[PDB]
């Protein structure tokens, strides 16, 4: 939009235009298992529609801050603290410089950073017409965080996603995704997860995200990870626009401020 991670109005300054970015409930955070509260009363995650193939009008868009997928299927998800049903509608990605040892992710587990984080954003379809409206209105939001590790073989469940990312390398580019199964973009087992109350990880940092962070990573290959760093971005500073490879598009970790992190039991 009109900010940046490092640069003009860098992430430390966001609070000046966007006060909520300074609240005590900001994401991302580090999560250590043994500091979480094991909560066996957590409701099992329930995914409706996620196994169905993607609709043909599902676009991925290079926004210059990330590559963003606007879902179309009626994807639903419930579980965790309550069985409240949310509608999945947006996917985003955060990365570093696309190397195995690299960081890049926003959340971390046991202090470990991963090369890539995918985030699926959800809202209450009963109170809002869309996710954007849900944001504007500070509705209950829900976000699932999927972390990645570089493996050996190409992860075919991600082929459509990666080809998409390639095809929107150029700034502002939009393109239709080939068919993909949303539920196949998650870790093979989803039972083990953390959940905490956080926020969007870039302006306007809306304070009402229930985060579900999965403990098991998803594997992709090097050539897959690599296309994310081929993404181009144009950013204004003063009376000039600068073109760069988009890199390190993650927010620095926030302080927990005594927030409780629940952990699921398996």
């Amino acid at each position: 939009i009109g900010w940046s991670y490092t640069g003009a109005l860098n992430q430390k300054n966001w609070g000046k235009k966007y006060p909520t970015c300074n609240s005590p409930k900001q994401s991302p955070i580090n999560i250590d298992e043994d500091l979480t509260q094991v909560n066996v009363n957590l409701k099992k995650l329930k995914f409706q529609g996620w196994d169905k193939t993607s609709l043909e009008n599902t676009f991925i868009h290079n926004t210059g801050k990330t590559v963003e997928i606007n879902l179309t299927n009626d994807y639903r998800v419930s579980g965790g603290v309550s069985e409240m049903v949310f509608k999945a509608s947006k996917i985003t990605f955060h990365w570093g410089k696309c190397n195995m040892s690299s960081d890049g992710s926003e959340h971390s587990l046991e202090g470990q950073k991963f090369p890539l984080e995918m985030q699926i954003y959800c809202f209450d379809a009963d109170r809002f017409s869309s996710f954007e409206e849900a944001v504007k209105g500070k509705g209950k939001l829900r976000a699932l965080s999927i972390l990645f590790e570089v493996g050996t073989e190409e992860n075919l469940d991600f082929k459509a996603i990666i080809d998409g990312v390639e095809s929107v390398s150029r700034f502002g580019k939009q393109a239709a995704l080939d068919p993909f199964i949303l539920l196949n973009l998650l870790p093979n087992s989803t039972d083990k997860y953390y959940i905490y109350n956080g926020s969007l990880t870039s302006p306007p940092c809306t304070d009402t995200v229930d985060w579900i962070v999965f403990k098991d990573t998803v594997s992709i290959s090097e050539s897959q990870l690599a296309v994310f760093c081929e993404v181009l971005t144009m950013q204004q500073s003063g009376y000039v626009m600068l073109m760069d490879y988009l890199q390190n598009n993650f927010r620095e970790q926030q302080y927990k401020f005594s927030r409780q992190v629940f952990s699921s039991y398996t």
Binding site: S169, R170, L232, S237, G238, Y239, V240, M241, L242
Partner: protein
Amino acid sequence: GYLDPFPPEERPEVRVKEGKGMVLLCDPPYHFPDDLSYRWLLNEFPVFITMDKRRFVSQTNGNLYIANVEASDKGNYSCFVSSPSITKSVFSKFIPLIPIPERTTKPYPADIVVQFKDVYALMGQNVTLECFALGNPVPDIRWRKVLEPMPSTAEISTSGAVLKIFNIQLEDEGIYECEAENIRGKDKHQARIYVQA
């Protein structure tokens, strides 16, 4: 008709390494009619920029496009705006540009940042279309009509970036495409010319 002056405030210095693409924004003042000619000055009036396939000035938005910055680009840049109908010109405070030298510049794939829009024209009018990409090496711009021949009198100017169609006929309407490319990658952009006769 009229043309206000550029603001007094200074334009902050910019340091960009050789090889990167950038756009210097003209940010033209309020004015009417909107038939301005745009030029850019180097350091002081009346020293005008050299234009070529690497440096392009858009006659729609007045911006200065530099495919890839080179050390020789060092200088201060001001947007020089002329309204022919009122014989008047105003130019802006200078953007001091300071290339940061590199021994091996980073390759960038052609990326189209000047993208023509759908155009509607009356039979007989001339139509002008702009296309330009940032990139390193400097990208080559190609034009074509999608799945049809180009109008026979169409002319390509300003080091490849500008397509002009003259005295447009109904047959000329259709989808036109811009292709930009260097060895590191390519980009393309499409839109429609409508002719109402």
